[PDB]
Amino acid sequence: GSNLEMRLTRGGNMCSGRIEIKFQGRWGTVCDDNFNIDHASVICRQLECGSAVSFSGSSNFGEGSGPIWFDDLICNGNESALWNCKHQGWGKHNCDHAEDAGVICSKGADLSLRLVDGVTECSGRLEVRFQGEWGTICDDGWDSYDAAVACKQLGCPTAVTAIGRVNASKGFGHIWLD
Amino acid sequence: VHLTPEEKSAVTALWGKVNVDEVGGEALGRLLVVYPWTQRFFESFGDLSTPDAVMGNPKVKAHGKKVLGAFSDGLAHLDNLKGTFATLSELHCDKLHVDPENFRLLGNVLVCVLAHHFGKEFTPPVQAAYQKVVAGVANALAHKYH
Amino acid sequence: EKVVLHPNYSQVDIGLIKLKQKVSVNERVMPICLPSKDYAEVGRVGYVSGWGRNANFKFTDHLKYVMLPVADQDQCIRHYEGSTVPEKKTPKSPVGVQPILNEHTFCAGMSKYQEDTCYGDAGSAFAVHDLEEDTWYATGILSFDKSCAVAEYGVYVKVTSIQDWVQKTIAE
Amino acid sequence: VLSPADKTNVKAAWGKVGAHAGEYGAEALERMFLSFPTTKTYFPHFDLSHGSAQVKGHGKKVADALTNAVAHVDDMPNALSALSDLHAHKLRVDPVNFKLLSHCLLVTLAAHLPAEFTPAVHASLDKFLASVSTVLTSKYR
Ligand code: HEM
Numbered sequence: 001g002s003n004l005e006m007r008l009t010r011g012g013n014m015c016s017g018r019i020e021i022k023f024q025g026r027w028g029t030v031c032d033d034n035f036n037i038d039h040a041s042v043i044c045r046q047l048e049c050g051s052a053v054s055f056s057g058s059s060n061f062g063e064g065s066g067p068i069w070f071d072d073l074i075c076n077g078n079e080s081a082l083w084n085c086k087h088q089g090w091g092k093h094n095c096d097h098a099e100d101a102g103v104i105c106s107k108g109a110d111l112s113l114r115l116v117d118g119v120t121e122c123s124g125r126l127e128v129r130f131q132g133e134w135g136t137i138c139d140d141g142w143d144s145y146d147a148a149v150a151c152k153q154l155g156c157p158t159a160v161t162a163i164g165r166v167n168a169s170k171g172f173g174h175i176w177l178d
Numbered sequence: 179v180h181l182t183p184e185e186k187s188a189v190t191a192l193w194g195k196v197n198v199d200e201v202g203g204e205a206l207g208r209l210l211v212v213y214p215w216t217q218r219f220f221e222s223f224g225d226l227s228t229p230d231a232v233m234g235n236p237k238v239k240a241h242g243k244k245v246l247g248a249f250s251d252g253l254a255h256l257d258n259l260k261g262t263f264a265t266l267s268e269l270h271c272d273k274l275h276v277d278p279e280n281f282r283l284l285g286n287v288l289v290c291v292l293a294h295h296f297g298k299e300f301t302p303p304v305q306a307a308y309q310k311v312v313a314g315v316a317n318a319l320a321h322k323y324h
Numbered sequence: 325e326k327v328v329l330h331p332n333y334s335q336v337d338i339g340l341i342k343l344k345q346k347v348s349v350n351e352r353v354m355p356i357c358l359p360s361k362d363y364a365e366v367g368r369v370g371y372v373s374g375w376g377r378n379a380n381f382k383f384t385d386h387l388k389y390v391m392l393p394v395a396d397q398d399q400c401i402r403h404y405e406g407s408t409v410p411e412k413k414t415p416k417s418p419v420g421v422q423p424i425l426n427e428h429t430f431c432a433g434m435s436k437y438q439e440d441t442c443y444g445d446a447g448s449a450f451a452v453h454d455l456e457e458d459t460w461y462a463t464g465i466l467s468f469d470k471s472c473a474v475a476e477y478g479v480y481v482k483v484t485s486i487q488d489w490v491q492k493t494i495a496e
Numbered sequence: 497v498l499s500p501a502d503k504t505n506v507k508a509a510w511g512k513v514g515a516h517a518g519e520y521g522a523e524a525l526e527r528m529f530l531s532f533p534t535t536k537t538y539f540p541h542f543d544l545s546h547g548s549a550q551v552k553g554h555g556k557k558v559a560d561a562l563t564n565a566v567a568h569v570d571d572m573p574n575a576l577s578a579l580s581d582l583h584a585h586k587l588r589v590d591p592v593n594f595k596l597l598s599h600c601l602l603v604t605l606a607a608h609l610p611a612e613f614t615p616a617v618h619a620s621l622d623k624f625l626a627s628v629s630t631v632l633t634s635k636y637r
């Protein structure tokens with residue numbers, strides 16, 4: 001089916017948002033049931049944006065409108081487009097409009113990490129550049145294991161990893177991760 | 179009659195320290211943002227949508243002076259409270275139609291405002307006397323209603 | 325003299341009371357009869373009078389009223405029962421008590437100034453003003469009044485759904 | 497009707513309370529007892545003397561429950577399910593007393609912590625306490 005079209009809505013960028021598929025001239029959404037990273041990778045590949053950073057359910061991007069096309073679909077991740085891989089039924093759904101699904105690709109995020117306002121180059125407040133904007137990470141759930149992963153990612157040695165910012169001030173802007 | 183002489187001394191004492199100019203605006207501003215159904219009666223005072231506008235509005239601050247002074251006037255003599263507030267109660271019952279509960283709510287907010295401005299000096303026995311004073315004033319301004 | 329309940333008291337919380345003798349219709353006593361059509365359309369602002377608890381939870385000594393607008397009956401169910409799909413419904417009422425929701429109910433949200441109905445207001449009438457006929461019609465009867473200011477929707481039993489049953493009981 | 501901006505203030509304000517929550521709950525309990533004498537009828541055997549250990553012990557458990565509710569702000573009825581049944585089905589505590597405790601608790605927080613009680617926080621913390629009282633009293637009969 002080459003007539004159908006895929007689009008992402010309410011994501012803040014062309015490569016992120018809630019899935020919107022047009023069929024018979026009507027725009028619809030995919031239910032959150034049985035949504036995996038394989039589904040996200042297939043959608044990101046169809047848009048040709050890039051790899052799939054994550055997937056979001058329960059209509060976090062927004063309460064969608066219109067009908068629901070695909071429900072309980074299973075996609076192995078190899079299929080180029082969602083509409084080609086196997087689904088239980090066409091136009092059939094046990095869901096409502098609080099289960100609309102959405103994906104976030106990797107082209108627009110650029111997903112970098114950095115430290116700001118610390119004593120040295122790799123000890124201080126941690127910031128994340130998501131969608132071209134630099135935000136921070138909440139302290140809840142921040143363990144020494146998370147510090148070790150970040151320290152390796154940036155480049156400084158993982159001999160001693162400690163949580164908490166030093167000498168830095170209260171951050172600014174969004175709080176992306178938590 | 180209503181209050182013991184030791185209770186009366188503390189209530190009159192704290193009322194000396196108060197800043198009438200700012201306390202009245204504080205309590206009125208808090209009631210208009212905590213219970214946001216009283217903004218209907220104060221539509222003559224301009225913009226009241228946001229809390230900073232409510233605090234920064236000159237009209238509510240001026241109206242706070244009137245509210246505070248009437249409270250001090252009521253404290254002059256307790257048994258006269260029926261006659262002291264009879265003139266004002268008619269205005270709040272026939273023209274504005276202010277429900278008696280809002281008198282009880284404003285008095286309760288006043289206790290919180292006084293506690294915020296004073297601190298540890300708001301001894302629990304002191305606030306007990308103040309609540310008895312507030313309950314009488316709310317009843318006195320509502321006893322006109324029939 | 326008599327207290328008649330609904331045949332299905334687990335689906336429509338409605339009960340009729342018969343007085344011993346008729347009450348004189350003064351300027352402070354007047355019946356309000358049932359509508360011929362449905363006024364429970366989203367946007368129909370109606371007046372609700374209450375005898376229940378106020379902001380201090382003490383029963384009001386004076387009759388009060390507030391205009392409440394009818395709300396879409398999808399976001400009301402999703403706010404209470406989790407979803408419109410029976411299989412995925414889970415109790416998530418922010419007050420801890422599940423309202424009785426079915427096709428014989430409509431939900432009215434808060435007013436402009438964030439006013440709602442707390443306990444003790446059940447049985448009240450969601451009266452709407454028919455400006456064309458200048459007559460007050462009862463469109464709903466308050467059933468779930470425990471929302472107060474925590475929840476966002478109060479559940480009212482539609483008068484039209486019980487209009488047929490009410491007439492039968494009155495005849496007897 | 498706690499908006500997402502309203503819950504952020506509640507968590508932050510309760511966080512600034514810190515370990516003094518148990519003492520704040522105890523002071524509010526004592527403050528309400530002497531200010532509203534009719535409330536003592538609901539505590540038949542408790543010693544109502546000022547500075548009593550039971551009052552201090554009760555204040556700690558009350559503040560413990562509230563601190564648990566803040567961590568479970570999104571789902572309050574389940575976090576307060578056991579307390580709702582005990583307060584309404586066993587002791588039949590009248591809902592009017594809850595608005596007395598909430599006011600006294602707010603006064604204690606305002607007096608002891610005046611700097612952080614901006615009017616924005618005052619409304620947010622008031623709406624949080626109103627949500628707790630409704631949950632506990634929602635099955636009174
Ligand atoms: C509880 C004790 C209260 C006291 C002692 C008090 C005192 C007063 C006084 C002395 C005035 C006269 C101002 C004037 O004539 O220019 C006034 C006006 C007014 N008060 Fe109160 N007040 C109280 C409570 C309230 C509350 C809770 C409300 C809530 C809306 C309210 C609503 C008004 C209004 C709308 C006016 C304007 C009257 C007008 O414009 O003609 N009052 N108040």
Ligand code: HEM
Pocket residue numbers: 535538539557558559561562579583587589593594597628629
């Ligand atoms: C936000 C409001 C309230 C909270 C969080 C709260 C919390 C609690 C807690 C944690 C307990 C201990 C239960 C146990 O240890 O098994 C308790 C017991 C009790 N509650 Fe409250 N309470 C509140 C309001 C009230 C009020 C206002 C009253 C009475 C006017 C009341 C009446 C009682 C009594 C009498 C007990 C003693 C039960 C016993 O000794 O077994 N509660 N409450």
Ligand SMILES: *[C@@H]1O[C@H](CO)[C@@H](O)[C@H](O)[C@H]1NC(C)=O
Pocket residue numbers: 117118119120167168169
């Ligand atoms: C952190 O320390 C550096 C020097 O190592 C200093 O220049 C900087 O101002 C400090 N950060 C803050 C937020 O004060």
Ligand SMILES: [Ca+2]
Pocket residue numbers: 032033099
């Ligand atoms: Ca699901």
Ligand SMILES: [Ca+2]
Pocket residue numbers: 031033071072094095
């Ligand atoms: Ca499904």
Ligand SMILES: [Ca+2]
Pocket residue numbers: 139140
């Ligand atoms: Ca934390």
